[PDB]
Design a protein around this motif. Structure first.
Motif, PDB file in Angstrom:
ATOM      1  N   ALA C  92      66.925  30.104  79.254  1.00 46.11           N
ATOM      2  CA  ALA C  92      67.587  28.815  79.441  1.00 46.11           C
ATOM      3  C   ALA C  92      67.092  27.803  78.395  1.00 46.11           C
ATOM      4  CB  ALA C  92      67.345  28.298  80.851  1.00 46.11           C
ATOM      5  N   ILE C 105      70.655  27.935  87.602  1.00 51.86           N
ATOM      6  CA  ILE C 105      70.977  27.783  86.187  1.00 51.86           C
ATOM      7  C   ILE C 105      70.999  29.172  85.553  1.00 51.86           C
ATOM      8  CG2 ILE C 105      70.214  26.845  83.959  1.00 51.86           C
ATOM      9  CD1 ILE C 105      68.902  24.614  85.952  1.00 51.86           C
ATOM     10  N   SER C 109      71.980  29.689  79.562  1.00 54.60           N
ATOM     11  CA  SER C 109      72.731  28.444  79.616  1.00 54.60           C
ATOM     12  C   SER C 109      71.927  27.326  78.960  1.00 54.60           C
ATOM     13  CB  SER C 109      73.137  28.085  81.046  1.00 54.60           C
ATOM     14  OG  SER C 109      72.020  27.785  81.849  1.00 54.60           O
ATOM     15  N   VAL C 123      75.400  26.906  87.656  1.00 59.77           N
ATOM     16  CA  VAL C 123      75.756  26.875  86.239  1.00 59.77           C
ATOM     17  C   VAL C 123      75.779  28.318  85.761  1.00 59.77           C
ATOM     18  CG1 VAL C 123      75.146  26.063  83.901  1.00 59.77           C
ATOM     19  CG2 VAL C 123      74.698  24.603  85.909  1.00 59.77           C
ATOM     20  N   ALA C 127      76.503  29.020  79.882  1.00 59.19           N
ATOM     21  CA  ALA C 127      77.221  27.744  79.859  1.00 59.19           C
ATOM     22  C   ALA C 127      76.498  26.706  79.014  1.00 59.19           C
ATOM     23  CB  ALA C 127      77.418  27.215  81.267  1.00 59.19           C
ATOM     24  N   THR C 128      77.256  25.764  78.463  1.00 58.68           N
ATOM     25  CA  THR C 128      76.640  24.595  77.845  1.00 58.68           C
ATOM     26  C   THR C 128      77.126  23.329  78.533  1.00 58.68           C
ATOM     27  OG1 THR C 128      76.460  25.638  75.662  1.00 58.68           O
ATOM     28  CG2 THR C 128      76.299  23.236  75.777  1.00 58.68           C
ATOM     29  N   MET C 142      81.308  26.620  84.487  1.00 56.27           N
ATOM     30  CA  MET C 142      81.260  27.693  83.504  1.00 56.27           C
ATOM     31  C   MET C 142      81.862  27.258  82.171  1.00 56.27           C
ATOM     32  SD  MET C 142      82.653  31.591  83.998  1.00 56.27           S
ATOM     33  CE  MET C 142      81.373  31.774  85.239  1.00 56.27           C
ATOM     34  N   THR C 144      81.780  26.602  77.621  1.00 56.93           N
ATOM     35  CA  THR C 144      81.214  25.756  76.578  1.00 56.93           C
ATOM     36  C   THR C 144      82.346  24.941  75.974  1.00 56.93           C
ATOM     37  OG1 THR C 144      81.476  27.457  74.843  1.00 56.93           O
ATOM     38  CG2 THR C 144      79.390  27.436  76.045  1.00 56.93           C
ATOM     39  N   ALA C 146      80.840  23.215  79.626  1.00 58.23           N
ATOM     40  CA  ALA C 146      80.944  23.637  81.017  1.00 58.23           C
ATOM     41  C   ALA C 146      81.980  22.813  81.762  1.00 58.23           C
ATOM     42  CB  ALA C 146      79.593  23.549  81.699  1.00 58.23           C
TER      43      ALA C 146
END
Lengths: 181, 180, 181
Positions: C92, C105, C109, C123, C127-128, C142, C144, C146
């Protein structure tokens, strides 16, 4: 030296001429075949399930290999099974998946629980292979989520063995430097 | 064992370089004056050489590597990084060229043969494709990374401000003795 | 043993039964609640700002937690605040954000400056979460960047505490092995 750690009485089993960098962390129920290499700051954590890696496979810098414990949320859990002549790129994230023989895992790619990567597959750098996804033998996959791009070429098929072969030669140089001690 | 000789080649460190004791630097690597290499970063110059300019940071968990020369990659790809470069946490740099006054976003990836010109921003999480040349004065974002907008004047100043902040920060970490 | 490091006169504060792997790196102004666990090759660097983590929270292998210093570019800076029963997946990247209680998380991500994750949020892996983005309680995010996907299930709601609890039990085993010494 605590790169290769016994966990609950279970010691990682290493084949002949395995390179584990002193800065790597391998824990518990893990087996590596002959000529494997685990590079700086990689983690292979076989605590809650088993991890099996074949011969001449590299686990490159910053990679994390882990598993999923058996519970009602995931009956039976997900072990991690990896074949021979597999090149696992820097910063890979492999979790509870199955990978065949002669496979290129691109740097910064992620392979998730229950995914199955067949023999002679290329996963492009940065790709994400979703839980339970099957990657068909002889193809290149790319993207998030990973999709089939094209069949591999004959040059690429050759590279699986040559590239793994180059990493075998390289880890032998690192072994000669005593980086595992 | 954070700074390791490989086949008789020892990393060359400039003045006041900070290498955290938990990072791993191997072989044919040169770091310019006031560079900093942060916890759990890897700079592996075994199969080719790596050169990093002055006042450049290589942040936590970054991996910097190269590509060996073979019929598959004639000549291979060394890794060349300029001055006042901020390489964000968990960055992945492989056989590329980075100019001066550049922000490499955390968790971004720069691939073999790519070239980042001076005063470029690579957004966090971006992937710069092999061979791609990023044009000076622009922000690149996405996977694959695309030109999004020109940098602002404040962003231009930040290349230097930020690199300077990391210079002062690595001096504090050196003072705590984290490299020994 | 240099996994827990004093910085400019400030030493990390660890609660009861906390596990920090000997290979992780914790610096400076960091507080961890009871039963937290920090796994191999994670970094929590509280040099230029404060980092606060609640109880029964895991920071998994290869994660990096950091902050943003106060300046004209970021008035007041961005500290890192994390609640209880938070599971921070492998690799992470948490930067200057706020995270509530009972949160998943996903591995790989990234949560960025000024982001706020409410209680009981998932999350997804990879994901971003963009700077300043607010994640609403009871939802799965979810992508990028998110985006909201769906509300969480009842089983997912129960998993926050189950999963966090499983990691508390796992860290006691790792402590029993002496991996923190």
């Amino acid at each position: 030296l605590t790169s290769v750690r016994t966990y609950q009485g279970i010691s990682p089993k290493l084949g002949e001429r395995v390179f584990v960098d002193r800065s790597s962390v391998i824990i518990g129920d893990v087996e590596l075949g002959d000529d494997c290499s685990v590079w700086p700051l990689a983690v292979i954590r076989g605590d809650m399930h088993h991890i099996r890696i074949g011969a001449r496979t590299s686990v490159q810098d910053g990679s994390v290999l882990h598993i999923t414990h058996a519970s009602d949320y995931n009956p039976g859990g997900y072990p991690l099974i990896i074949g021979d002549d597999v090149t696992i790129g820097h910063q890979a994230m492999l979790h509870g998946c199955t990978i065949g023989n002669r496979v290129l895992i691109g740097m910064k790619s992620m392979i998730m629980d229950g995914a199955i990567v067949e023999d002679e597959v290329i996963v492009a750098a940065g790709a994400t292979v979703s839980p339970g996804k099957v990657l068909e033998s002889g193809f290149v996959y790319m993207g998030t989520p990973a999709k089939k791009v094209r069949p591999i070429t004959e040059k690429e098929r050759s590279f699986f063995t040559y590239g793994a072969g180059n990493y075998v030669r390289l880890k032998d140089k690192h072994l000669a430097e005593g980086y595992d001690r």
